[PDB]
putative Metal ion transporter
Amino acid sequence: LQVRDIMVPRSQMISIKATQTPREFLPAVIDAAHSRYPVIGESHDDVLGVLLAKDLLPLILKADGDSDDVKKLLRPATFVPESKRLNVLLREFRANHNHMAIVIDEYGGVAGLVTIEDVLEQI
Amino acid sequence: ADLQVRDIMVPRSQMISIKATQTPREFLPAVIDAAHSRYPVIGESHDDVLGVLLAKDLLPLILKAGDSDVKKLLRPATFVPESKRLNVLLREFRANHNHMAIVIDEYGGVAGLVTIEDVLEQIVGDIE
Ligand SMILES: Nc1ncnc2c1ncn2[C@@H]1O[C@H](COP(=O)(O)O)[C@@H](O)[C@H]1O
Ligand SMILES: Nc1ncnc2c1ncn2[C@@H]1O[C@H](COP(=O)(O)O)[C@@H](O)[C@H]1O
């Protein structure tokens, strides 16, 4: 199997727009209750990095944390091609201690996202 | 290799936990530093696990007035014995979609904690 077969497709990704402050994005984030979210720029094809929910914790004890710039909290996205084999990806997740990869198509567009939990249900 | 939970667990003395009497103002510094997704919450001692706190459940405090009692956020813990085999543990993580279990010794005390990531660390191959 390949990543493209088991990915969360681009339309179904819950993403955070990089222009939004926590005041604006947190309601949808809290509703979705995911651990990690792609952060986008101009479009769903413009993935800037990934936001970990737990990385928002420092904002609780700030004066004005609800107005912070999310770009500063970003981790780089791990990118994989659509054709990446699942057995290879699983070994990569172990080596790099990550949970999420952003899937890019043959044109560099964003196909979707894929997680370690999803890989385990398929191989 | 008949691998068991005790072979891969984070032992009790190395667990980062939160005391159920602590406010977020009190526990957040330790929680932020440790940077885990999930924390056992303890009552009277490290053996008295009340449940688990998910870091992501603290997000509403960014917007709310609150940082001065954790118990309302508590999720039930999943408990497993030290002797459970890893193949069985993996099936349970997959069946219940949980990531963490609290490991219990033969006396009912807390031996440590164990995660799905710890299982995969043990069983998945190196990059070839
Ligand atoms: N940001 C996201 N958008 C859409 N689906 C996601 C996202 N993060 C995780 N998932 C899916 O939800 C599952 C559980 O992840 P989580 O909710 O973070 O525990 C994953 O295995 C993916 O299928
Ligand atoms: N509360 C905790 N205390 C100590 N170690 C932990 C805790 N949570 C997770 N771990 C360990 O850290 C690894 C990564 O989990 P996390 O930091 O939550 O992404 C796990 O696989 C465990 O080895």
Q: What stands out?
A: Residues A 8, 12-14, 34-37, 115, 117-118 surround adenosine monophosphate (ligand 1) (CB under 6 Å).
